[PDB]
Amino acid sequence: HHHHFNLPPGNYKKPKLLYCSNGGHFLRILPDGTVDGTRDRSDQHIQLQLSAESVGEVYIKSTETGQYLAMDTDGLLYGSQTPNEESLFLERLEENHYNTYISKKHAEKNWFVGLKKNGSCKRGPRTHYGQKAILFLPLPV
Protein backbone atom coordinates (compact mmCIF):
# COMPACT_ATOMS: atom_id res chain seq x y z
CA HIS A 1 0.00 0.00 0.00
CA HIS A 2 1.26 3.42 -0.95
CA HIS A 3 -2.00 4.92 0.24
CA HIS A 4 -4.06 5.36 3.40
CA PHE A 5 -7.11 3.19 4.03
CA ASN A 6 -9.74 5.68 5.13
CA LEU A 7 -12.86 4.55 3.28
CA PRO A 8 -15.99 6.57 2.51
CA PRO A 9 -19.34 5.47 3.94
CA GLY A 10 -21.98 4.24 1.52
CA ASN A 11 -22.63 1.24 -0.68
CA TYR A 12 -22.82 0.20 -4.30
CA LYS A 13 -26.42 -1.06 -4.24
CA LYS A 14 -27.67 1.77 -6.43
CA PRO A 15 -26.11 3.78 -9.29
CA LYS A 16 -24.79 7.26 -8.52
CA LEU A 17 -23.84 10.60 -9.97
CA LEU A 18 -20.20 11.58 -9.31
CA TYR A 19 -20.45 15.30 -8.56
CA CYS A 20 -17.17 17.18 -8.60
CA SER A 21 -17.06 20.20 -6.32
CA ASN A 22 -14.28 21.83 -8.36
CA GLY A 23 -16.60 23.09 -11.07
CA GLY A 24 -19.88 21.47 -10.19
CA HIS A 25 -19.76 18.90 -13.01
CA PHE A 26 -20.98 15.32 -13.03
CA LEU A 27 -18.44 12.76 -14.32
CA ARG A 28 -19.56 11.60 -17.78
CA ILE A 29 -18.61 8.67 -20.02
CA LEU A 30 -19.69 9.32 -23.63
CA PRO A 31 -20.53 6.54 -26.15
CA ASP A 32 -17.44 7.28 -28.23
CA GLY A 33 -15.36 6.39 -25.16
CA THR A 34 -14.73 10.04 -24.33
CA VAL A 35 -14.63 11.14 -20.67
CA ASP A 36 -15.58 14.58 -19.38
CA GLY A 37 -18.00 16.37 -17.12
CA THR A 38 -21.36 18.09 -17.49
CA ARG A 39 -23.60 20.22 -15.33
CA ASP A 40 -26.65 18.81 -17.14
CA ARG A 41 -28.23 16.44 -14.60
CA SER A 42 -30.55 15.10 -17.29
CA ASP A 43 -27.56 13.81 -19.28
CA GLN A 44 -27.97 10.06 -19.85
CA HIS A 45 -24.28 9.27 -19.57
CA ILE A 46 -23.61 10.50 -16.04
CA GLN A 47 -25.45 7.62 -14.35
CA LEU A 48 -22.67 5.49 -12.96
CA GLN A 49 -22.80 2.11 -11.28
CA LEU A 50 -19.95 1.38 -8.87
CA SER A 51 -18.98 -2.15 -7.92
CA ALA A 52 -16.33 -3.46 -5.56
CA GLU A 53 -13.56 -5.84 -6.50
CA SER A 54 -11.57 -6.05 -3.26
CA VAL A 55 -12.30 -3.92 -0.23
CA GLY A 56 -11.75 -0.33 -1.29
CA GLU A 57 -11.31 -1.10 -5.01
CA VAL A 58 -14.08 -0.23 -7.45
CA TYR A 59 -15.15 -0.28 -11.09
CA ILE A 60 -17.07 2.77 -12.37
CA LYS A 61 -19.39 1.81 -15.22
CA SER A 62 -21.84 3.83 -17.31
CA THR A 63 -25.29 2.32 -16.85
CA GLU A 64 -26.29 3.65 -20.29
CA THR A 65 -23.52 2.28 -22.46
CA GLY A 66 -21.99 -0.26 -20.10
CA GLN A 67 -18.50 1.21 -20.61
CA TYR A 68 -16.00 0.99 -17.73
CA LEU A 69 -14.02 4.08 -16.71
CA ALA A 70 -10.31 3.40 -17.15
CA MET A 71 -7.07 5.42 -17.25
CA ASP A 72 -4.41 4.74 -19.87
CA THR A 73 -0.66 4.67 -19.63
CA ASP A 74 -0.36 8.41 -20.30
CA GLY A 75 -2.88 9.11 -17.53
CA LEU A 76 -5.69 9.85 -19.95
CA LEU A 77 -9.18 8.67 -18.91
CA TYR A 78 -11.37 6.75 -21.38
CA GLY A 79 -14.34 4.39 -21.49
CA SER A 80 -13.51 0.68 -21.83
CA GLN A 81 -15.72 -2.06 -23.29
CA THR A 82 -14.58 -4.54 -20.66
CA PRO A 83 -13.23 -4.20 -17.09
CA ASN A 84 -9.43 -4.50 -17.33
CA GLU A 85 -6.57 -3.70 -14.97
CA GLU A 86 -6.80 -0.05 -16.03
CA SER A 87 -10.47 0.00 -14.94
CA LEU A 88 -9.78 -0.50 -11.24
CA PHE A 89 -9.74 2.50 -8.88
CA LEU A 90 -8.99 2.91 -5.14
CA GLU A 91 -12.03 4.65 -3.66
CA ARG A 92 -10.97 6.62 -0.56
CA LEU A 93 -12.39 9.22 1.80
CA GLU A 94 -10.71 12.64 1.58
CA GLU A 95 -10.79 15.63 3.92
CA ASN A 96 -13.09 13.55 6.15
CA HIS A 97 -15.88 14.12 3.58
CA TYR A 98 -15.35 13.64 -0.14
CA ASN A 99 -14.65 10.57 -2.25
CA THR A 100 -11.52 10.33 -4.39
CA TYR A 101 -10.50 7.69 -6.90
CA ILE A 102 -6.90 6.68 -7.54
CA SER A 103 -5.93 4.55 -10.53
CA LYS A 104 -4.96 1.20 -9.04
CA LYS A 105 -2.52 0.48 -11.86
CA HIS A 106 -0.87 3.90 -11.43
CA ALA A 107 -1.35 4.18 -7.67
CA GLU A 108 2.34 4.64 -6.98
CA LYS A 109 2.29 7.82 -9.06
CA ASN A 110 -0.82 9.16 -7.32
CA TRP A 111 -2.85 9.53 -10.52
CA PHE A 112 -6.45 10.54 -9.67
CA VAL A 113 -9.77 10.83 -11.47
CA GLY A 114 -10.42 14.59 -11.58
CA LEU A 115 -12.46 17.31 -13.34
CA LYS A 116 -11.34 20.86 -14.13
CA LYS A 117 -13.66 23.84 -13.60
CA ASN A 118 -14.21 23.86 -17.37
CA GLY A 119 -15.56 20.32 -17.33
CA SER A 120 -12.66 18.56 -19.06
CA CYS A 121 -10.98 15.63 -17.21
CA LYS A 122 -7.55 15.97 -15.68
CA ARG A 123 -4.67 13.89 -17.02
CA GLY A 124 -3.20 11.55 -14.37
CA PRO A 125 0.22 13.24 -13.86
CA ARG A 126 -1.52 16.61 -13.58
CA THR A 127 -3.44 15.43 -10.52
CA HIS A 128 -2.31 15.22 -6.88
CA TYR A 129 -3.46 15.30 -3.24
CA GLY A 130 -4.76 18.71 -2.26
CA GLN A 131 -6.50 19.57 -5.55
CA LYS A 132 -10.18 20.40 -5.63
CA ALA A 133 -10.40 18.62 -9.02
CA ILE A 134 -10.02 15.19 -7.37
CA LEU A 135 -12.89 15.74 -4.87
CA PHE A 136 -16.19 13.95 -5.55
CA LEU A 137 -19.58 13.68 -3.83
CA PRO A 138 -21.66 10.67 -4.92
CA LEU A 139 -25.32 11.58 -5.35
CA PRO A 140 -28.32 9.23 -5.85
CA VAL A 141 -29.72 9.04 -9.41
Q: How many domains does the chain have?
A: 1
β-strands 68-71, 89-94: how paired?
unpaired
Nearest to 101 by CA among 63, 141, 131: 131
Alpha carbons 18 and 33: distance in angstroms, whole number: 17
The amino acid sitting at 21 is S
- Report yes or no: 31 and 65 within 8 Å, Cβ to Cβ: yes
Alpha carbons 134 and 21: distance in angstroms, whole number: 9
18: buried, middle or exposed (CB in 10 Å: 19+, 13-18, 0-12)?
Answer: buried
Q: Is 22 assigned to a binding site?
A: yes
Cα→Cα distances 108→1, 27, 37, 48, 92, Å? 9, 23, 26, 26, 15
> Hey, which residues does 53 pair with through a beta bridge?
none
Alpha carbons 103 and 86: distance in angstroms, whole number: 7
| Sequence-separated (6 or more) residues with CB below 8 Å from residue 28 | 35, 36, 37, 38, 43, 45, 46
β-strands 35-38, 16-20: how paired?
unpaired
Chain-centre distance for alpha carbon 18: 7
Method: X-ray
Domain hosting residue 56, numbered range: 1-141
**C-alpha count within 13 angstroms, C-beta hemisphere, residue 56:** 12
Residue 68 sits in a domain whose CATH number is 2.80.10.50
Quick count: other Cβ atoms within 10 Å of Cβ 36? Answer: 18
* DSSP track, 49-65: EEEESSTTEEEEEETTT
* DSSP track, 10-29: --SSS-EEEEETTTTEEEEE
